[PDB]
A paper describes a structure:
The crystal structure of TaHAL was solved, and we found that, similar to other members of the ammonia-lyase family, TaHAL crystallized as a homotetramer. Moreover, it exhibited electron density consistent with the MIO moiety known to provide catalytic activity in this enzyme class. Notably, there is a clear enrichment of negatively charged residues on the surface of the protein. It has been observed that an enrichment of negative charges on the surface of a protein can contribute to solubility and acid stability, and perhaps the observed enrichment of negative surface charges contributed to TaHAL’s resistance to acid and heat stresses. Measuring the temperature-dependent conversion of histidine to trans-urocanic acid by TaHAL in buffer A showed an increase in enzymatic activity with a maximal kcat at 60 °C. Upon heating the cuvette to 90 °C, only small changes in the absorbance at 222 nm and the spectrum as a whole were observed, indicating that the TaHAL protein retained much of its secondary structure even at high temperatures. The pH profile of TaHAL activity showed an optimum pH between pH 8 and 10. We found that TaHAL activity was well maintained with exposure to pH 4, but the activity decreased when TaHAL was incubated at pH 3 and below. Exposure to pH 2.8 allowed for the recovery of ~20% activity following neutralization, but 97% of the TaHAL activity was lost following 2 hours at pH 2.5. Upon titration with phosphoric acid, the protein appeared to maintain nearnative secondary structure until a pH of ~3, consistent with the observed partially irreversible loss of activity seen at pH levels below 4.
HAL is a tetrameric enzyme that catalyzes the first step in histidine catabolism and thus is important for central metabolism; consequently, it exists in a wide variety of organisms from across the tree of life. We decided to use the enzyme histidine ammonia lyase (HAL), an enzyme from a family with broad synthetic and therapeutic applications, as a test case. Specifically, we demonstrate that the HAL enzyme originating from the archaeon [name] is tolerant to both heat and acid stresses. [name] histidine ammonia lyase was identified as an enzyme with a promising catalytic profile following acid treatment.
Author numbering:
A (entry chain A), B (entry chain A), C (entry chain A), D (entry chain A): 0 to 51, 63 to 140, 144 to 496
The structure:
Amino acid sequence: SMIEIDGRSLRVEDVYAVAVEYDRVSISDDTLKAVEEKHEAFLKLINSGKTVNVHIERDQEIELQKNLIRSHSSGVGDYLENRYVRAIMAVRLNSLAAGYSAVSADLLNMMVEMLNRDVIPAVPKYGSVGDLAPLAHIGLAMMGEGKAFFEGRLMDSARALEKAGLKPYQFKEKEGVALINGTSFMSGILSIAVMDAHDILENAIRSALLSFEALGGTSKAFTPWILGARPHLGQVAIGNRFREYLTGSDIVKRADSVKVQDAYTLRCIPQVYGSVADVIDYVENVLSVEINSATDNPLFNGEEVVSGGNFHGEPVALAADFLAIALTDLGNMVERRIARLVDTNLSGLPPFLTPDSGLNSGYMIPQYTAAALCNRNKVLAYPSSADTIPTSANQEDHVSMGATGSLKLLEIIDNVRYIIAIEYLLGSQALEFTDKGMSPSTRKIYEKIREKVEKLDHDRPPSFDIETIRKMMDKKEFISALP
Amino acid sequence: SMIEIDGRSLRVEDVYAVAVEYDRVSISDDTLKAVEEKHEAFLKLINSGKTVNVHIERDQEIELQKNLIRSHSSGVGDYLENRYVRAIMAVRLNSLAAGYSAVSADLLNMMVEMLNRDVIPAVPKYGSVGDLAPLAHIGLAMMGEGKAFFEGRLMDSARALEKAGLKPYQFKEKEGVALINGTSFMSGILSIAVMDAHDILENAIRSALLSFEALGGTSKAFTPWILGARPHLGQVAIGNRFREYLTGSDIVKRADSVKVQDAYTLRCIPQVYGSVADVIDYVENVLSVEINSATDNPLFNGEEVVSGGNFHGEPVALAADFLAIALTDLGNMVERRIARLVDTNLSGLPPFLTPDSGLNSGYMIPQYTAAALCNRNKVLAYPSSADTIPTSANQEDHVSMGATGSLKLLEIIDNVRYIIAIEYLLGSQALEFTDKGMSPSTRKIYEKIREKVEKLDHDRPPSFDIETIRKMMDKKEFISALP
Amino acid sequence: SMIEIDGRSLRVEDVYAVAVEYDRVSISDDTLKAVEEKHEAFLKLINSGKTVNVHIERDQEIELQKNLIRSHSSGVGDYLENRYVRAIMAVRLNSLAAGYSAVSADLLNMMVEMLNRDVIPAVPKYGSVGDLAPLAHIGLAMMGEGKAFFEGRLMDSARALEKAGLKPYQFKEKEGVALINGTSFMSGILSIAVMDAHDILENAIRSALLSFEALGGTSKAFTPWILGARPHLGQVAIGNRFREYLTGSDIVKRADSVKVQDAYTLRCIPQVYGSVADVIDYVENVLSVEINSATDNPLFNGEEVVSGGNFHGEPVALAADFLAIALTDLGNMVERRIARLVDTNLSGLPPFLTPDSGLNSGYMIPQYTAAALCNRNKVLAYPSSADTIPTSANQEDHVSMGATGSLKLLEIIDNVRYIIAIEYLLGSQALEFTDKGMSPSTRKIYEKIREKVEKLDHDRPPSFDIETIRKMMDKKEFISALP
Amino acid sequence: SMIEIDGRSLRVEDVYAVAVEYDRVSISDDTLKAVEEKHEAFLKLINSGKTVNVHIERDQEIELQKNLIRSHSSGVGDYLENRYVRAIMAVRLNSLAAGYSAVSADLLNMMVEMLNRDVIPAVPKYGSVGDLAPLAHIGLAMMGEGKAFFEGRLMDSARALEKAGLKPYQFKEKEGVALINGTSFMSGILSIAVMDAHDILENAIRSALLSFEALGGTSKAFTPWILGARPHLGQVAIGNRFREYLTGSDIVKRADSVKVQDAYTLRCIPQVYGSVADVIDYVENVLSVEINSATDNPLFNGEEVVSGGNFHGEPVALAADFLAIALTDLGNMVERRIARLVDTNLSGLPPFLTPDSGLNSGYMIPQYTAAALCNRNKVLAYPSSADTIPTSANQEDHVSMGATGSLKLLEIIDNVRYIIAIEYLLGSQALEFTDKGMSPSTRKIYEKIREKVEKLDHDRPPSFDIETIRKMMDKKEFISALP
């Protein structure tokens, strides 16, 4: 489909649509004409200010934009994946169209065409203290220097632009400044991350259904009036989701007739998962403002140019560290439920979910892998925004460090996705030891798993099944299986 | 004054009023009669359930409540300060009155009288994994065992109750369970913490006025349309506060005539401080639900008793870790502004703010102290809720660890308060090297400082002046000086 | 007894003897005469340098030392406990006597008399970035200003000195510089900490004996040739200690006849505890150099005065963070063994170690307390020395942050001591459910516990028994019971 | 060249030689015959034990080894780089030859041929809690299942073995157990890491020479008697290295005539860098024992098979976290020196090292990149070994988490290498603003830089020059330039 950019209407899910699903972007002629008219008012104002040799003056200003793009292109490390650079470019484009950046219509159209033709700059992941260097690398590619991916093939930027039918872009007065000042690296990455955090929670709900039924949990933990006696919006909503999906379970109807309560990895699912949902909503609210905001500097309002601090990443740096914590602890709870599934003394199922403990270990070791992933996430959950280091000869003497936070959030998301893939695998196997009177919803998840991953009889490498299920998650196959 | 408790109307500032300002609490006869009627419905229901020897049965149930209070009284370490135990008791009382805990009117009245007569249990700080043990210690004192403070003097609980004219309380059916299950230790401490976080931000605004004027900052960073181009509510509100307080400054009017922009510790005050305000608001919203919620277990709705997981601390454990991060980074920005004040090459003022660098160090070393405090806060900002350790033979196999988070937030608050006291001290001294054309608002802060702390001429121990200013902050003298 | 100081022979256990056991210090007349002769050579050299008005010159130099002591007295927060300030003073005194500090004999004798008469400066804990401010507070008291404890009573320093029969000390040329530059705050605190870490390991060995016998462990895990197949010195030594102490156990002889192996909290005791012993030895080696080193600045060698960087805390800042980690993980292993003791499915003993699970919880909750303490230690194990913040207008632009690390190590030590007290309590109770055929060594620990703490029948507050056992540990009663 | 393996002589630098420089490994016929004779004694012992149907018994034992390899092959995530898998394989091979693992000569020869023919298993990085899963993946490839790299091309393991002229290996009695139990993943990776940490320190010495001369430092900070007044071995050795390399500097001879002391990033180089050297030596000592130790389980001594805990990673898990901290703080000091170089008020050189601050930013932004890298390292320096999560239904209830620590140490090393590359770049540029009277040693570093990276006149992307210098470091070109 088509995402129209007007500088004020971008949603986080539209950033995803462009970056991950490759929807086209466009900008109306009306928007572009108003952008251009503001760009011209800005030129008139600076041309009057300087005269209170015109040719040497303009050529100097153009050289400045180039020197800035080049000197600031100082990232190191592996290139950021293309889905993230596309997200950053969509957010950057939208925020330059918000009306305060005084850039020209041509700069916006340049970014539109790079996105629609998939000329994606090569952006080293590291260098922003929260985003001059990564955005400079984007501009460097826009100028036809450095490297870029053309339809996923790395090459010199000038060759990628040429294969796409584009000309290198020449930055005008203050357009390099505009492009590289702001929070679009952090906010673009975090837009994708918050969408992937939502997808994590959705998958954790579905994978918990399998474990919850295999362990014969009671629905009493999701009683509406209990959940409403402590009405955080997340836990009320999560309780509703679980009640709906457990409807029709014979296993759970039996449990309700003979069980009072379960261990916390079942009974506390609404409190914990609903906290995670609340944090996701918090971050999405921050981003919803941020990706429609002017975060470059200085800014132009049509009659004056004023320097402020809107490039400072603090609100999104804090949000990235917060969501990292919440997701790490979601992963801890899923790992603990996996640890209960394979422990015959807690589950009431055969040890380690194998039919012959004699010469098989079953799924003993994926639980270690899940614990390993939690331990890695506990390192990564240290808040990068609790630190700051002065830059620019102490003139930029407090910084958010939110780029660190955005990048490590991406790894936590990757790791928690593997933990949940492990719960899909082991919860499906655990149900093989039940009478399978699971709800229709649980059975949709179970059947989708079994389309690609067989039940476990003799030992075989769990790694391959985990990777298959992780690929299914990344293709949204369980959300499709059970809306 | 008087705070009336009805189980549904408690605000965080009312918890503060009771705990810190010693306002009386009361519960209307109407509330108490409805609590008692629900308690009696619960007894009828459990008495009918058991009969589908009455005397031995009831005596057994009473012994159970006692065994629970005693066995769970397993905290270690120093006693929590009385203002916090009072906050916890007010939140506990309100949440047992929310209508689902089936306790008797007498238990609530017991807690009312302990608060109004200042019989405050001795509560070891450590033991909750997020709050059985600390709340058990409260109940232990309520039973007249263990220790308590009577009007601030430590003694055996039975002696404290007797000096207050109270009888030890005997817990009825499920009343010990009700008292010790829930989140009131975390939520009571965090209610006081979020009030103190607000007071921190208020003091940081006032102490920044001194530095901002001494460094001759330009008001251009607070231009309304710039701040509104990125309209996070915090930074818009903070900008308004600073514009109002800088009104009437000759220093700033001059700066605006000759300066374009300042370093980030001045120019980025709205982005960073407004992020902190937003986080404070987030936490207050969580607590506003939590302290009016039923977090004990099982719960009673008038016709059935159901076990759920509302005691699980996750939403407030996450909130405590989040606020710890935001406050640590506020402290980093204040420390960096202090570092600019004493550096003659950044400030344009005499080195280290002494009139004779020859044989004096001036205020060189308080900046080290501020850095030391930041480094301590960077340790404490590690999120305790990213971890979990299984308890109760793996039946309580995921826990929030939010008690850790509440307690370390209190230390961060203490440390940031000292950083701000240091900025009050050094910003006031720095203004001695200006023409003092500061705004009327800044001058109110400056004059309040000078009522108790003299300007620096010859070197003298900064420790004593820092402590004086910290005491003034704790008595709210700068908020009084400048509303 | 008597510790003689000569600037080159101090051991960490001598620092403990002075600071904690109140042994007297002395300095021979020979040492003092050589110190004085070097002080006089230094004066001659600086008096010749300045002359390539003598009265105004010397008076200026004296005023400088005073200004330095006062201006640098900039700590905040609670006063450090007297045992630590005594340790710091003993290390400071020894390191000024090492021969490079050019101080006078009178300064050393001043410190000797403060220690022997117990006039201990009041030292705010916070302010060093790794130790100007805390050592300045010591000097401030030495000058008779600020506050001090006289035989444990806080008062004005001049009054404490007067009650002790001492005169205030007047610092001579470069003597204030000498006193306040160096690492003695970090190294004094860490000398006590490493002694207390050793005492922790010794107590953990003894408390593990109780659990190991109650769980019927097999001695096969301590087989000498197994431990020697991986000959880290710690695990070989720990294995020898456990073999010796388990000699004579009927329980273990039975286990060896029917068991192949135990869970890791028993079988891996040598690997983990021996790693801890190795780290303790590492730190002691660092301190053994450091407390006999010249860490002030500039230094004097008898013919020239040269400025170097020996005050930089890096080797002891790293050591403090390392030992914090090792002790935190020792506490994790003890907590996991406690978690096994109270879980009937792992221990083979009654659930939660109570004789009547019907209406008692036994020792269910001390395991939560141990988990809580581990979670707190996981926050505190963040390495403060991984951070640095520039001080002194960027002239002191990398600092160790080792004071933070020393102080948080003290809390970890306190917390792990409580975890071990909990294992003493619960391992002794667990043996009540065995036939008591424990070794003579284990029985010495068991009997010492039972001298003050009764076995558990009906529920009672574990807090009080934990505190009693912690007090016994602090009085070294189990090391006395079993050498 | 040729590394001969005998189970007891392996050095960390030999692991590097095999893994990184592709030296061949061999095992003498004598070693192999004694390994085989012990394997046969083990078979005799277990065959006698079982008989106190032989065919079904042996076939069962073989199936067990296969089930174990497969079930434990449960890693997730990207494949570990081949240099690390080669290191792990060399350490595993040596430790199985140490004499206690009872494996056959054929298993050792299999590993020898995989290394010498470069058939390197594909090993997912994540899964060990400290190394069943990664070592299982190695064995899986050895069995001809899963994936492997043949001369760097990924393919099915059976195809890689076939292209190399090898047959799949069939694991004999207890040989799969032997292969997958132990610490070789952690210890192999850490052997390469400690070699790369040494190479980091060596490069940091050389890059500091450039900055030290450009800033005109005084050699007084390296005076031998000062450094020996605090004789930690590292700082004495580092001081000697710097004195030797600064010999012949006209710049430094001038500085010594007019300067007393420098800022800490120059004056404290011996204290900090020597601490790092000491930590490196500590880790190398641990590894020197560990890679020659029997860490599998159970172990065989020729007459009995006994289960112990030598697989527990604690000593190397702690060492990996320790070295991570020390290297992070080395990176902080290098970043602070970079921050001094580009600040004209600290350096005395043109702002940001550009000849025309008018329209150029010079090397302003690489300092941000260095700060960004430090902030990332501060996250990664959180100690993974402070945490533990129970595995295997609580039977493996304390684990080292040292695999996490080894992997994140590799990233810290990568990041610090970039920081040092930045100092090479900017220190060389800074010398362009001096009279170049640098020492012959410094000039060797400067000239080697200038062979590939030109001085900066007009702004250009620093990223490319940083990457070039990082590649030069990885090819050891500065150690070659200046031994």
